[PDB]
Structure 1
């Protein structure tokens, strides 16, 4: 009766006068009291106040409607309980009038609502605000400040940081503070235009601390580690190299220039949570995380790229070459045993069995935790064949040589794995892998189906007089002899109808030719741009994986012996492990104000 008129009146807002008339009707009916006035002024179904209904429906008159409503609620002394009301609805639980004023880009109204005593820490926690599944609902972090930041409203974010009531470090239900949220949202540069990076800068420069980067969500991740876990690259390039110019907040930088003399200068990065000296560093996450599908642009960043080069120069090159050597000796001993098949066997076969058991143990250990795992799946099968053949050597059987020589051929096929460590030959083996995986496997099945069709065809014809093409297996073999050039084409004899025989065979030849032609065609289309980039990316990623695989094989004391980086004196006492990188910049000339060391060493 009286309510719905007021709700529709604030929704349309064609005239604030009739709104004043309805409010005067309510004021005259107030003789019957706040607890009743609230229910008369709020829709009890969803827990939606008329202020919410006013702010959801924006028109040029809304700025006056809000002032009238708040003056009324202050004249009736209900204002504190009225502004801070939230939805009882399950999906919308926690949303307040301020979140609406922010989501609909109202600057002045938000200022008025905060000045009237709005709660700035109100958590919006609902199914719509906490989407379990993507593409339905929006996650911003479940705080008004995080909303104002994720929606690119710097002025309102400054307003909300100005108030002492604001809790910057407040963690939401998921455990995320504001910075984790900004990491969650930062899809891409072209999509967003990199406004999130600016806000990430502004909030930290507003609150000078390490706490915000220190804190962790319920998944137990710092926002650096969260940026690494998710596929967020453009923000990680910013986090991972920060140069704060202000001397008061210069401690919060992670890149320090200590040696600038002119065009030549060496920066100094921080390897605190990055250099694999912690539980899960950035270099571990970005490599061992398969769900990213963007790791090409992750490992080219300033510290990580050089860390990989340095680890390779120090220890991983020698370990890789050494392992290759042992495998090479092993395979040659296997060939020397199998080609000549006892006093030399006592020296050889013992090492052979030991190293086979070793590879099998390692492969069975690492196969349970998992186109990157294929080779490692094959090294196990080889050692299985070897140990099986060595068992069947002492056992009395003839089927030992089969598994033995299959293990041989498989070893000489597996040695392709170690060509991946070479600089130039690595991308070649990656090309082998990608092409054999994608381009050829399409050709092969569609060729097998023609084989098995024309096989039964020719076995149906040429079986008339039991013969050149005999049973099915022999006919399929003869067709495979034909596609190479080995099978001599026989004039149709012992055949019912020779002309159809010859025609059907020539059709097989032509279809095989055009099918070979099309695999070549799709190949030509593949090579130009995508194939080259894919090869380089896969090679770099593979090397990174290998470097960190060998990094965890070393003893505990050895890793501390290498210990990439040096302890620099930064700030009053930063005392953090750092990585020095010398660079030369001729483009921009700037009088070097911020420098750590005065004498450039």
Structure 2
């Protein structure tokens, strides 16, 4: 066969003269119209050609080999259907020799193929280039431009972008253009060294127009909203504060420093698809998405940070204080009706207050629970969890009122439980103030993480040693002959031995007293070791971690509270507050900008730019 011979001659690369001889023989066989030639030059099963097979196997003599191949293809009026042949297998469907020459980082051969008529707008629409899980496949955007950008080849990107037949605004299978793909591909700084930000800037400037940043994929997400959805904090920080000092490409800017004098700088950030006045802005996405665990770093970027601060100052501080005050007085009245229980002049007025407010709290938190998506409950020290305890407490209040209207005695258990749970739930509000935030998060961390683990293992200890010391104690005819008598007696004596209210020397009444005292001292020693283990874990691990984790949790709960409060307002009130003022940026731009003055006292630079040089 000649197909396998030419394939090996072009793949091994140790012989270009052998493929030259085989090509002479191919022309001889063709002397006896184009289809037979490309059926003898491409594998019929997959679709790989001698160009693909030559580019997959790179050797020092592959430039001359591809020159020979393209010369033979041009000398037969077949170069068109040969240089733009694509795979046919459902795994690499649409892959071309330009994709293969770019994945191999071959700049010379790529320029050759583009100058010889390769479609720079080819789409690698195969299941390898549109995978479902990483490490099996590689998604780059299904385009030689997107492939050269995603694999850090700025010169091939320049070569493809200076082309005329290229299409920067072309959307792939997912609707992703070059910028959605660059956002999808960005990982971190400790992983990529921040070249995707540079490629983003390059491809956005060279095509200076808002058509790339305003394009929505098949999910409706722009590149900026996509960077918000998947927590690409570096790409998002670049886009949200992007300042082009060139005079022509300044309409591509999102931050316009117009004021800087010394260490001071009054900039103007853009709030077009950011400030919670659209369907899903960068603020709402950044706040509400709990599938990243990078919100702590994204809620600190200048426009989002200042937007949340100003929403707080304007209305959400007051709405939060009113929420806290109403819950505080509801808890006080619940306490008063629990203490002064019957064992109707103004008492029933207060009970009806707590009943209607329990119904209100219950419907509110139940609505919040219905639309409460999972992955919110991923972390225990998360605000989403509170909706559950507020709902449980309101339910206990209304259930206690229901059981009290009827002739039931168990209404008091529900009433006291509801009072206790309300006073516990005040922890949600103490996590909303700033100092009390750190204190309350430390307390709640200690409890929910360490106290519960220690209490599980300590209940194991308690039950084991209670059975051990109860079985070692002889029944006797009914005043307290023993102290470790019934099982509950033994568990109580061990528990108050732990908390320092117990004595090691009690009425023995056991027939194996040395074994009894050995087991008792063993209990004491093992529970001391366990207690000290938990105490050491606390005193060491949390002196540094929860210190900041407090600020993380406070910031997240604060943002979520601000956004839900802003949603609660009537549309005219939102229109009243609506931080951000209109600003003319270009001939006709007129965007809603937010002015942020930042004084950085560690400044060593000089500023010369403006929009209104006169300091405001």
So what's the TM-score if we normalise by structure 1? 0.97
Aligned pair partner of 1:346 in 342, 345, 348: 348
- SS of the residue corresponding to residue 228 of structure 1 reads helix
Cα distance in 2, alignment partners of residues 584 and 532 from structure 1 = 26
What CA deviation, in whole Å up to 9, does each residue of 1:137-178 have, x standing for no partner? 111110000000011111111111112211111000111000
Q: Is the 8 A contact 1:492 1:498 kept in 2?
A: no
Cα distance in 1, alignment partners of residues 26 and 76 from structure 2 = 11
- Residue 255 and residue 398 in structure 1: after superposition, are their counterparts in 2 closer, same or farther (change >3 A)? same
Stretch deviating more after TM superposition (363-372 or 319-328)? 363-372
Cα distance in 2, alignment partners of residues 58 and 573 from structure 1 = 52
Cα distance in 2, alignment partners of residues 118 and 272 from structure 1 = 39
- SS of the residue corresponding to residue 578 of structure 1 reads strand
What CA deviation, in whole Å up to 9, does each residue of 1:376-403 have, x standing for no partner? 2101111111111111212112111111
Q: Is the 8 A contact 2:434 2:554 kept in 1?
A: no
- Residue 136 and residue 265 in structure 1: after superposition, are their counterparts in 2 closer, same or farther (change >3 A)? same
- Residue 286 and residue 18 in structure 1: after superposition, are their counterparts in 2 closer, same or farther (change >3 A)? same
C-alpha displacement of 1:41: 0.9
Cα distance in 1, alignment partners of residues 464 and 483 from structure 2 = 18
Stretch deviating more after TM superposition (73-82 or 373-382)? 373-382
- Residue 20 and residue 409 in structure 1: after superposition, are their counterparts in 2 closer, same or farther (change >3 A)? same
What CA deviation, in whole Å up to 9, does each residue of 1:517-555 have, x standing for no partner? 111122233124322222221111111111111111111
- SS of the residue corresponding to residue 212 of structure 1 reads coil
C-alpha displacement of 1:486: 1.9
- Residue 588 and residue 488 in structure 1: after superposition, are their counterparts in 2 closer, same or farther (change >3 A)? closer
- Residue 463 and residue 175 in structure 1: after superposition, are their counterparts in 2 closer, same or farther (change >3 A)? farther
- Residue 384 and residue 585 in structure 1: after superposition, are their counterparts in 2 closer, same or farther (change >3 A)? closer
Cα distance in 2, alignment partners of residues 323 and 244 from structure 1 = 44
Stretch deviating more after TM superposition (62-71 or 522-531)? 522-531
Cα distance in 2, alignment partners of residues 599 and 500 from structure 1 = 90
Cα distance in 2, alignment partners of residues 288 and 431 from structure 1 = 24
Q: Is the 8 A contact 1:430 1:535 kept in 2?
A: yes
What CA deviation, in whole Å up to 9, does each residue of 1:461-504 have, x standing for no partner? 11443532222122112211211122344434321211111110
- SS of the residue corresponding to residue 582 of structure 2 reads strand
Cα distance in 1, alignment partners of residues 154 and 169 from structure 2 = 18
Q: Is the 8 A contact 1:492 1:502 kept in 2?
A: no
Unpaired runs of at least 5, structure 1: none
C-alpha displacement of 1:421: 1.3
Cα distance in 2, alignment partners of residues 426 and 76 from structure 1 = 77
Q: Is the 8 A contact 1:464 1:495 kept in 2?
A: no
What CA deviation, in whole Å up to 9, does each residue of 1:273-296 have, x standing for no partner? 111001111111111111111111
Q: Is the 8 A contact 2:483 2:506 kept in 1?
A: no
- Residue 463 and residue 217 in structure 1: after superposition, are their counterparts in 2 closer, same or farther (change >3 A)? farther
C-alpha displacement of 1:591: 6.2
- SS of the residue corresponding to residue 295 of structure 2 reads coil
Stretch deviating more after TM superposition (114-123 or 467-476)? 467-476
- Residue 544 and residue 586 in structure 1: after superposition, are their counterparts in 2 closer, same or farther (change >3 A)? closer
Q: Is the 8 A contact 2:504 2:520 kept in 1?
A: no
- SS of the residue corresponding to residue 383 of structure 2 reads coil
Aligned pair partner of 1:477 in 472, 492, 500: 492
Cα distance in 1, alignment partners of residues 543 and 101 from structure 2 = 51
Stretch deviating more after TM superposition (137-146 or 452-461)? 452-461
- Residue 336 and residue 538 in structure 1: after superposition, are their counterparts in 2 closer, same or farther (change >3 A)? same
2:95 alignment counterpart = 95
Cα distance in 1, alignment partners of residues 550 and 57 from structure 2 = 54
- Residue 14 and residue 493 in structure 1: after superposition, are their counterparts in 2 closer, same or farther (change >3 A)? closer
Structure-to-structure mapping, 1:40-439, within 5 angstroms? 40-340=40-340, 342-370=344-372, 371-439=382-450
What CA deviation, in whole Å up to 9, does each residue of 1:403-448 have, x standing for no partner? 1011111111111211111111101111122222222222111111
C-alpha displacement of 1:593: 4.3
- Residue 67 and residue 455 in structure 1: after superposition, are their counterparts in 2 closer, same or farther (change >3 A)? same
Cα distance in 1, alignment partners of residues 208 and 493 from structure 2 = 79
Stretch deviating more after TM superposition (494-503 or 63-72)? 494-503
Q: Segments of 4+ in structure 1 off by > 4 A?
A: 585-593
- Residue 392 and residue 588 in structure 1: after superposition, are their counterparts in 2 closer, same or farther (change >3 A)? closer
What CA deviation, in whole Å up to 9, does each residue of 1:11-39 have, x standing for no partner? 11223212111100111111332100100
C-alpha displacement of 1:261: 4.2
C-alpha displacement of 1:262: 4.6
Q: Is the 8 A contact 1:312 1:547 kept in 2?
A: yes
What CA deviation, in whole Å up to 9, does each residue of 1:568-593 have, x standing for no partner? 11111211111111123566666654
Cα distance in 2, alignment partners of residues 281 and 403 from structure 1 = 43
- Residue 586 and residue 439 in structure 1: after superposition, are their counterparts in 2 closer, same or farther (change >3 A)? closer
- SS of the residue corresponding to residue 336 of structure 1 reads helix
- SS of the residue corresponding to residue 60 of structure 2 reads coil
Cα distance in 1, alignment partners of residues 470 and 226 from structure 2 = 63
Cα distance in 2, alignment partners of residues 142 and 293 from structure 1 = 29
Q: Is the 8 A contact 1:295 1:541 kept in 2?
A: yes
Cα distance in 2, alignment partners of residues 14 and 390 from structure 1 = 91
Q: Is the 8 A contact 1:492 1:501 kept in 2?
A: no
Unpaired runs of at least 5, structure 2: 373-381
C-alpha displacement of 1:458: 1.4
